[PDB]
């Protein structure tokens, strides 16, 4: 029940690690939820059209779709930006 | 077969790292399995209705769906809570 | 082109970090590929039947499906086990 | 509003951690986008055919599909390779 090799004691500071993977992932979603349902749309009805990458072919057929993922890598970073500042200040505790 | 640059020796303490990504992810699922099949439902037949976020439109159409992901970020954290305490004590070894 | 705040220099030892997320994830899949196409099946035609969790209902309807995810958390750990030992020794370099 | 146990102050250097999970994942996609839409195809119209793993059966029916995931683990590593070098030098700032 206590100290051998299969069971060290209680699941130690593996606690924060697990929390890392479990809450980081959870965080990941909120981040995107915002960008896919708010951000992307906004940028779409204002500053310009949404996307452009259904672009290629090349004596074979690669894709500019590559770029698209980057372009968003770019706007996906952004949402975090706007997230941190809007949240760092308006931190209400209920 | 031994020491150059492409092969250092044996796959060293990359061991725990791999285990991190492989078992953290695995953990992630159990966490959710609980929340999606037990927790969420419970909170649904008792303390109140499940969700509310199919809410928006805005001279364009963003979404409160944003919130939903957060609201769950909130309840997804919770399941971990109840998980740790119910498990930290009832730690049986078969 | 060099040292301000937006661009530090070259994408530094963020290199290993990126490699972590990019190759750990990649690893994650191989791990599972094995368990879903080899391991799980094996354990299914020999030591016994595959799974059991389509089990519940409870004056509401939660699920033992919860367990299933754990049971596999258990066998998903295993595949890593058998993976490391079978690979640590049979390390051929082509 | 300040220092108790539920709220430490402001969401501290959990900042980089979150950024890790949020941008590493984001990175992960671009990596693959390239390999699935450019790399894999290329290697397919030139150096040879794409894949081979729809291979097995074994007095039961396991799969070489196992290998496939590894083979790609191999080519998925590669794309990173070509990514870093093509990018480390052509680092333009707009």
Tab-separated table of C-alpha atoms in Angstrom:
chain	number	residue	atom	x	y	z
A	1	UNK	CA	0.000	0.000	0.000
A	2	UNK	CA	3.004	2.319	0.444
A	3	UNK	CA	6.626	2.259	-0.926
A	4	UNK	CA	7.821	-0.202	-3.586
A	5	UNK	CA	8.388	0.613	-7.283
A	6	UNK	CA	4.980	0.326	-8.953
A	7	UNK	CA	3.311	2.777	-6.505
A	8	UNK	CA	5.498	5.678	-5.187
A	9	UNK	CA	2.970	7.017	-2.600
A	10	UNK	CA	0.223	9.340	-3.899
A	11	UNK	CA	0.177	10.773	-7.426
A	12	UNK	CA	2.716	13.520	-6.619
A	13	UNK	CA	3.608	16.679	-8.496
A	14	UNK	CA	2.515	14.876	-11.603
A	15	UNK	CA	-0.522	16.838	-10.439
A	16	UNK	CA	0.495	20.084	-12.130
A	17	UNK	CA	1.704	18.166	-15.214
A	18	UNK	CA	-1.667	16.506	-15.656
A	19	UNK	CA	-3.332	19.868	-14.993
A	20	UNK	CA	-1.065	21.279	-17.679
A	21	UNK	CA	-2.220	18.908	-20.376
A	22	UNK	CA	-5.842	18.919	-19.112
A	23	UNK	CA	-6.291	22.680	-18.720
A	24	UNK	CA	-3.958	23.821	-21.468
A	25	UNK	CA	-5.980	21.812	-23.942
A	26	UNK	CA	-9.167	23.173	-22.435
A	27	UNK	CA	-7.723	26.653	-22.792
A	28	UNK	CA	-6.744	25.912	-26.385
A	29	UNK	CA	-10.411	25.454	-27.239
A	30	UNK	CA	-11.695	28.630	-25.713
A	31	UNK	CA	-8.949	30.480	-27.626
A	32	UNK	CA	-10.193	29.051	-30.904
A	33	UNK	CA	-13.894	29.244	-30.120
A	34	UNK	CA	-13.349	33.014	-30.067
A	35	UNK	CA	-11.386	33.133	-33.303
A	36	UNK	CA	-13.680	30.794	-35.249
A	37	UNK	CA	-16.977	32.338	-34.095
A	38	UNK	CA	-16.098	35.950	-33.390
A	39	UNK	CA	-12.677	37.096	-34.707
A	40	UNK	CA	-12.548	35.373	-38.124
A	41	UNK	CA	-16.103	36.451	-38.883
A	42	UNK	CA	-15.453	40.070	-37.830
A	43	UNK	CA	-12.313	40.372	-39.932
A	44	UNK	CA	-14.593	38.985	-42.631
A	45	UNK	CA	-17.375	41.570	-42.658
A	46	UNK	CA	-14.967	44.474	-42.159
A	47	UNK	CA	-11.170	44.707	-42.855
A	48	UNK	CA	-11.805	42.399	-45.830
A	49	UNK	CA	-12.760	38.902	-47.053
A	50	UNK	CA	-12.063	35.808	-44.955
A	51	UNK	CA	-9.590	33.559	-46.793
A	52	UNK	CA	-7.719	32.824	-50.017
A	53	UNK	CA	-5.815	29.537	-50.488
A	54	UNK	CA	-7.971	27.378	-52.697
A	55	UNK	CA	-5.211	28.571	-54.987
A	56	UNK	CA	-2.931	25.855	-56.501
A	57	UNK	CA	-1.673	23.267	-58.992
A	58	UNK	CA	1.936	22.680	-60.167
A	59	UNK	CA	2.683	20.008	-62.898
A	60	UNK	CA	1.243	17.996	-60.088
A	61	UNK	CA	-1.040	19.725	-57.598
A	62	UNK	CA	0.380	21.029	-54.364
A	63	UNK	CA	-1.462	23.706	-52.447
A	64	UNK	CA	-1.297	27.271	-51.177
A	65	UNK	CA	-3.514	25.755	-48.563
A	66	UNK	CA	-0.122	25.558	-46.872
A	67	UNK	CA	-0.151	29.298	-46.496
A	68	UNK	CA	-3.699	29.354	-45.196
A	69	UNK	CA	-2.627	27.365	-42.146
A	70	UNK	CA	0.143	29.899	-41.588
A	71	UNK	CA	-2.017	32.947	-42.250
A	72	UNK	CA	-4.269	31.636	-39.484
A	73	UNK	CA	-1.212	30.714	-37.398
A	74	UNK	CA	-0.857	34.428	-37.668
A	75	UNK	CA	-4.470	35.366	-36.830
A	76	UNK	CA	-4.717	32.531	-34.219
A	77	UNK	CA	-1.793	34.148	-32.404
A	78	UNK	CA	-3.680	37.436	-32.575
A	79	UNK	CA	-6.815	36.256	-30.762
A	80	UNK	CA	-4.547	35.372	-27.857
A	81	UNK	CA	-3.208	38.917	-28.033
A	82	UNK	CA	-6.612	40.552	-27.822
A	83	UNK	CA	-7.562	37.913	-25.251
A	84	UNK	CA	-4.834	38.647	-22.751
A	85	UNK	CA	-5.232	42.426	-22.738
A	86	UNK	CA	-9.070	42.432	-22.608
A	87	UNK	CA	-8.901	39.921	-19.759
A	88	UNK	CA	-5.861	41.061	-17.734
A	89	UNK	CA	-7.738	44.228	-16.774
A	90	UNK	CA	-11.421	43.225	-16.683
A	91	UNK	CA	-10.665	40.490	-14.124
A	92	UNK	CA	-13.903	40.276	-12.093
A	93	UNK	CA	-14.290	37.640	-9.345
A	94	UNK	CA	-17.879	36.373	-8.784
B	1	UNK	CA	26.037	1.688	-33.976
B	2	UNK	CA	27.163	3.948	-31.108
B	3	UNK	CA	28.311	7.643	-30.938
B	4	UNK	CA	28.099	10.043	-33.897
B	5	UNK	CA	25.475	12.792	-34.352
B	6	UNK	CA	22.431	11.092	-35.877
B	7	UNK	CA	22.222	8.445	-33.096
B	8	UNK	CA	23.263	9.565	-29.547
B	9	UNK	CA	23.101	6.081	-27.902
B	10	UNK	CA	19.657	4.850	-26.780
B	11	UNK	CA	16.552	7.052	-26.731
B	12	UNK	CA	17.495	8.752	-23.436
B	13	UNK	CA	15.414	10.807	-21.040
B	14	UNK	CA	13.296	11.712	-24.005
B	15	UNK	CA	11.578	8.730	-22.396
B	16	UNK	CA	9.666	10.778	-19.830
B	17	UNK	CA	8.944	13.482	-22.440
B	18	UNK	CA	7.343	10.974	-24.777
B	19	UNK	CA	5.504	9.475	-21.796
B	20	UNK	CA	4.344	12.994	-21.014
B	21	UNK	CA	2.708	13.564	-24.366
B	22	UNK	CA	1.505	9.930	-24.618
B	23	UNK	CA	0.018	9.585	-21.131
B	24	UNK	CA	-1.040	13.177	-20.605
B	25	UNK	CA	-3.164	12.948	-23.717
B	26	UNK	CA	-4.483	9.599	-22.564
B	27	UNK	CA	-5.295	11.188	-19.227
B	28	UNK	CA	-6.983	14.098	-20.987
B	29	UNK	CA	-9.529	11.685	-22.430
B	30	UNK	CA	-10.461	9.951	-19.238
B	31	UNK	CA	-10.970	13.409	-17.686
B	32	UNK	CA	-13.447	14.323	-20.401
B	33	UNK	CA	-15.110	10.931	-20.673
B	34	UNK	CA	-16.267	11.578	-17.102
B	35	UNK	CA	-17.475	15.107	-17.756
B	36	UNK	CA	-19.249	14.320	-21.035
B	37	UNK	CA	-20.957	11.111	-19.863
B	38	UNK	CA	-21.394	11.617	-16.139
B	39	UNK	CA	-20.807	15.200	-14.887
B	40	UNK	CA	-22.470	17.265	-17.649
B	41	UNK	CA	-25.499	14.984	-17.633
B	42	UNK	CA	-25.824	15.098	-13.823
B	43	UNK	CA	-25.620	18.880	-13.676
B	44	UNK	CA	-28.301	18.625	-16.351
B	45	UNK	CA	-30.966	16.610	-14.544
B	46	UNK	CA	-30.380	18.404	-11.239
B	47	UNK	CA	-28.769	21.847	-10.528
B	48	UNK	CA	-30.327	23.000	-13.818
B	49	UNK	CA	-30.348	22.758	-17.637
B	50	UNK	CA	-27.215	21.830	-19.582
B	51	UNK	CA	-26.188	24.755	-21.804
B	52	UNK	CA	-27.100	28.148	-23.253
B	53	UNK	CA	-25.016	29.723	-26.050
B	54	UNK	CA	-26.969	29.217	-29.231
B	55	UNK	CA	-27.475	32.872	-28.411
B	56	UNK	CA	-26.143	35.418	-30.983
B	57	UNK	CA	-26.148	37.756	-33.986
B	58	UNK	CA	-24.658	41.288	-34.231
B	59	UNK	CA	-25.095	43.362	-37.495
B	60	UNK	CA	-23.127	40.382	-38.619
B	61	UNK	CA	-23.372	37.177	-36.604
B	62	UNK	CA	-20.775	36.420	-33.984
B	63	UNK	CA	-21.552	33.974	-31.219
B	64	UNK	CA	-21.982	33.567	-27.477
B	65	UNK	CA	-20.802	30.124	-28.371
B	66	UNK	CA	-17.559	31.768	-27.284
B	67	UNK	CA	-18.806	31.763	-23.738
B	68	UNK	CA	-19.959	28.170	-23.923
B	69	UNK	CA	-16.376	27.032	-24.447
B	70	UNK	CA	-15.391	29.052	-21.388
B	71	UNK	CA	-18.332	27.946	-19.261
B	72	UNK	CA	-17.146	24.397	-19.920
B	73	UNK	CA	-13.526	25.487	-19.422
B	74	UNK	CA	-14.998	26.177	-16.053
B	75	UNK	CA	-16.871	22.870	-15.608
B	76	UNK	CA	-14.024	20.901	-17.321
B	77	UNK	CA	-11.690	22.217	-14.624
B	78	UNK	CA	-14.220	21.046	-12.051
B	79	UNK	CA	-14.275	17.385	-13.101
B	80	UNK	CA	-10.544	17.356	-12.432
B	81	UNK	CA	-11.314	18.756	-8.992
B	82	UNK	CA	-13.789	16.042	-8.091
B	83	UNK	CA	-11.457	13.554	-9.777
B	84	UNK	CA	-8.396	14.241	-7.682
B	85	UNK	CA	-10.131	14.167	-4.302
B	86	UNK	CA	-12.262	11.052	-5.005
B	87	UNK	CA	-9.136	9.288	-6.255
B	88	UNK	CA	-6.394	10.539	-3.897
B	89	UNK	CA	-8.067	8.678	-1.030
B	90	UNK	CA	-9.732	5.643	-2.638
B	91	UNK	CA	-6.382	4.505	-4.081
B	92	UNK	CA	-6.729	0.694	-4.192
B	93	UNK	CA	-3.945	-1.457	-5.701
B	94	UNK	CA	-5.118	-4.722	-7.366
C	1	UNK	CA	16.305	43.054	-39.379
C	2	UNK	CA	18.088	42.352	-36.074
C	3	UNK	CA	17.394	43.400	-32.411
C	4	UNK	CA	14.209	45.189	-31.310
C	5	UNK	CA	11.265	43.571	-29.475
C	6	UNK	CA	9.101	41.977	-32.169
C	7	UNK	CA	12.014	39.946	-33.642
C	8	UNK	CA	14.689	38.687	-31.152
C	9	UNK	CA	17.159	37.329	-33.785
C	10	UNK	CA	16.455	33.841	-35.188
C	11	UNK	CA	13.810	31.499	-33.769
C	12	UNK	CA	16.016	30.354	-30.860
C	13	UNK	CA	15.690	27.386	-28.539
C	14	UNK	CA	11.995	27.572	-29.181
C	15	UNK	CA	13.338	25.039	-31.673
C	16	UNK	CA	13.234	22.101	-29.267
C	17	UNK	CA	9.879	23.295	-27.863
C	18	UNK	CA	8.297	23.282	-31.300
C	19	UNK	CA	9.950	19.916	-31.973
C	20	UNK	CA	8.424	18.755	-28.707
C	21	UNK	CA	4.868	19.536	-29.698
C	22	UNK	CA	5.447	18.497	-33.345
C	23	UNK	CA	7.201	15.178	-32.715
C	24	UNK	CA	5.524	14.258	-29.453
C	25	UNK	CA	2.176	14.454	-31.185
C	26	UNK	CA	3.572	12.489	-34.095
C	27	UNK	CA	4.836	9.922	-31.618
C	28	UNK	CA	1.443	9.849	-29.915
C	29	UNK	CA	-0.090	8.552	-33.133
C	30	UNK	CA	2.332	5.760	-33.767
C	31	UNK	CA	1.755	4.642	-30.156
C	32	UNK	CA	-1.973	4.392	-30.772
C	33	UNK	CA	-1.771	3.018	-34.295
C	34	UNK	CA	-0.163	-0.025	-32.663
C	35	UNK	CA	-2.741	-0.352	-29.908
C	36	UNK	CA	-5.782	0.186	-32.140
C	37	UNK	CA	-4.653	-2.089	-34.992
C	38	UNK	CA	-2.463	-4.665	-33.293
C	39	UNK	CA	-2.669	-4.726	-29.459
C	40	UNK	CA	-6.421	-4.226	-28.879
C	41	UNK	CA	-7.249	-6.784	-31.553
C	42	UNK	CA	-4.777	-9.348	-30.160
C	43	UNK	CA	-6.069	-9.027	-26.612
C	44	UNK	CA	-9.419	-9.540	-28.321
C	45	UNK	CA	-8.872	-12.880	-30.046
C	46	UNK	CA	-6.904	-14.307	-27.117
C	47	UNK	CA	-6.845	-13.238	-23.401
C	48	UNK	CA	-10.545	-12.394	-23.821
C	49	UNK	CA	-13.172	-10.105	-25.403
C	50	UNK	CA	-12.368	-6.505	-26.326
C	51	UNK	CA	-14.523	-4.149	-24.239
C	52	UNK	CA	-17.439	-3.766	-21.832
C	53	UNK	CA	-18.850	-0.313	-20.976
C	54	UNK	CA	-22.038	0.042	-22.952
C	55	UNK	CA	-23.212	-0.616	-19.420
C	56	UNK	CA	-25.287	2.169	-17.745
C	57	UNK	CA	-28.358	4.145	-16.675
C	58	UNK	CA	-29.084	5.706	-13.241
C	59	UNK	CA	-32.486	7.481	-12.590
C	60	UNK	CA	-30.952	9.525	-15.326
C	61	UNK	CA	-28.379	7.895	-17.588
C	62	UNK	CA	-24.712	8.308	-16.839
C	63	UNK	CA	-22.218	5.850	-18.246
C	64	UNK	CA	-19.647	3.209	-17.373
C	65	UNK	CA	-18.219	4.459	-20.606
C	66	UNK	CA	-16.228	6.473	-18.080
C	67	UNK	CA	-14.430	3.330	-17.071
C	68	UNK	CA	-13.789	2.293	-20.647
C	69	UNK	CA	-11.631	5.372	-21.169
C	70	UNK	CA	-9.697	4.426	-18.043
C	71	UNK	CA	-9.447	0.733	-18.876
C	72	UNK	CA	-7.807	1.838	-22.121
C	73	UNK	CA	-5.793	4.471	-20.236
C	74	UNK	CA	-4.530	1.304	-18.699
C	75	UNK	CA	-3.974	-0.666	-21.931
C	76	UNK	CA	-2.754	2.497	-23.780
C	77	UNK	CA	-0.014	2.792	-21.160
C	78	UNK	CA	0.818	-0.852	-21.814
C	79	UNK	CA	1.506	-0.498	-25.544
C	80	UNK	CA	4.153	2.045	-24.600
C	81	UNK	CA	5.590	-0.562	-22.250
C	82	UNK	CA	5.884	-3.248	-24.897
C	83	UNK	CA	7.033	-0.541	-27.311
C	84	UNK	CA	10.018	0.653	-25.338
C	85	UNK	CA	11.443	-2.779	-24.546
C	86	UNK	CA	10.958	-4.244	-28.062
C	87	UNK	CA	12.586	-1.127	-29.503
C	88	UNK	CA	15.348	-0.308	-26.984
C	89	UNK	CA	17.160	-3.498	-27.995
C	90	UNK	CA	16.270	-4.038	-31.668
C	91	UNK	CA	17.640	-0.585	-32.562
C	92	UNK	CA	18.886	-1.043	-36.153
C	93	UNK	CA	20.288	1.935	-38.106
C	94	UNK	CA	19.734	1.803	-41.912
D	1	UNK	CA	-9.732	41.367	-5.404
D	2	UNK	CA	-6.071	40.722	-4.522
D	3	UNK	CA	-4.291	38.016	-2.399
D	4	UNK	CA	-6.069	34.944	-0.999
D	5	UNK	CA	-5.823	31.393	-2.405
D	6	UNK	CA	-8.351	31.212	-5.244
D	7	UNK	CA	-6.897	34.279	-7.050
D	8	UNK	CA	-3.076	34.799	-6.792
D	9	UNK	CA	-2.972	38.265	-8.482
D	10	UNK	CA	-2.979	38.330	-12.307
D	11	UNK	CA	-2.564	35.220	-14.463
D	12	UNK	CA	1.237	35.122	-14.043
D	13	UNK	CA	3.885	33.258	-15.996
D	14	UNK	CA	1.215	30.736	-16.780
D	15	UNK	CA	1.237	33.146	-19.716
D	16	UNK	CA	4.063	31.407	-21.567
D	17	UNK	CA	2.639	27.978	-20.637
D	18	UNK	CA	-0.713	28.814	-22.180
D	19	UNK	CA	1.113	30.310	-25.170
D	20	UNK	CA	3.015	27.040	-25.372
D	21	UNK	CA	-0.060	24.880	-25.709
D	22	UNK	CA	-1.900	27.487	-27.839
D	23	UNK	CA	0.893	28.273	-30.304
D	24	UNK	CA	2.607	24.902	-30.317
D	25	UNK	CA	-0.640	23.318	-31.410
D	26	UNK	CA	-1.112	26.062	-33.966
D	27	UNK	CA	2.407	25.387	-35.183
D	28	UNK	CA	1.682	21.663	-35.312
D	29	UNK	CA	-0.972	22.320	-37.942
D	30	UNK	CA	1.098	24.438	-40.243
D	31	UNK	CA	3.776	21.713	-40.096
D	32	UNK	CA	1.281	19.120	-41.275
D	33	UNK	CA	-0.555	21.332	-43.742
D	34	UNK	CA	2.754	21.411	-45.628
D	35	UNK	CA	3.349	17.675	-45.455
D	36	UNK	CA	-0.212	16.661	-46.354
D	37	UNK	CA	-0.673	19.137	-49.224
D	38	UNK	CA	2.833	19.668	-50.545
D	39	UNK	CA	5.461	17.170	-49.279
D	40	UNK	CA	3.501	13.882	-49.354
D	41	UNK	CA	2.146	14.683	-52.804
D	42	UNK	CA	5.594	15.623	-54.167
D	43	UNK	CA	7.237	12.465	-52.868
D	44	UNK	CA	4.289	10.820	-54.602
D	45	UNK	CA	4.719	12.080	-58.159
D	46	UNK	CA	8.510	11.763	-58.036
D	47	UNK	CA	10.755	9.622	-55.728
D	48	UNK	CA	7.977	7.005	-55.833
D	49	UNK	CA	4.415	6.039	-54.820
D	50	UNK	CA	2.783	7.473	-51.699
D	51	UNK	CA	2.075	4.655	-49.229
D	52	UNK	CA	1.943	0.910	-48.597
D	53	UNK	CA	0.351	-0.499	-45.414
D	54	UNK	CA	-3.040	-1.797	-46.418
D	55	UNK	CA	-0.948	-4.917	-45.996
D	56	UNK	CA	-2.075	-7.393	-43.263
D	57	UNK	CA	-3.884	-10.344	-41.681
D	58	UNK	CA	-2.490	-12.902	-39.178
D	59	UNK	CA	-4.708	-15.873	-37.993
D	60	UNK	CA	-6.582	-12.861	-36.795
D	61	UNK	CA	-6.046	-9.557	-38.583
D	62	UNK	CA	-3.556	-7.084	-37.219
D	63	UNK	CA	-2.128	-4.417	-39.474
D	64	UNK	CA	1.039	-3.087	-41.073
D	65	UNK	CA	-0.932	0.090	-40.798
D	66	UNK	CA	1.209	0.263	-37.668
D	67	UNK	CA	4.225	0.865	-39.829
D	68	UNK	CA	2.471	3.477	-41.921
D	69	UNK	CA	2.117	5.705	-38.868
D	70	UNK	CA	5.836	5.273	-38.243
D	71	UNK	CA	6.868	5.734	-41.865
D	72	UNK	CA	5.070	9.077	-41.685
D	73	UNK	CA	6.520	9.699	-38.213
D	74	UNK	CA	9.612	9.555	-40.313
D	75	UNK	CA	8.427	11.830	-43.152
D	76	UNK	CA	6.553	14.127	-40.678
D	77	UNK	CA	9.882	14.723	-38.940
D	78	UNK	CA	11.358	15.538	-42.339
D	79	UNK	CA	8.966	18.373	-43.205
D	80	UNK	CA	10.151	20.062	-40.024
D	81	UNK	CA	13.696	19.598	-41.291
D	82	UNK	CA	13.061	21.262	-44.628
D	83	UNK	CA	10.928	23.818	-42.785
D	84	UNK	CA	13.580	25.059	-40.407
D	85	UNK	CA	16.342	25.480	-42.982
D	86	UNK	CA	14.150	27.136	-45.665
D	87	UNK	CA	12.821	29.506	-43.007
D	88	UNK	CA	15.881	30.214	-40.822
D	89	UNK	CA	17.489	32.053	-43.740
D	90	UNK	CA	14.581	33.545	-45.713
D	91	UNK	CA	13.357	35.400	-42.605
D	92	UNK	CA	11.712	38.539	-44.054
D	93	UNK	CA	9.943	41.032	-41.750
D	94	UNK	CA	6.972	42.898	-43.330
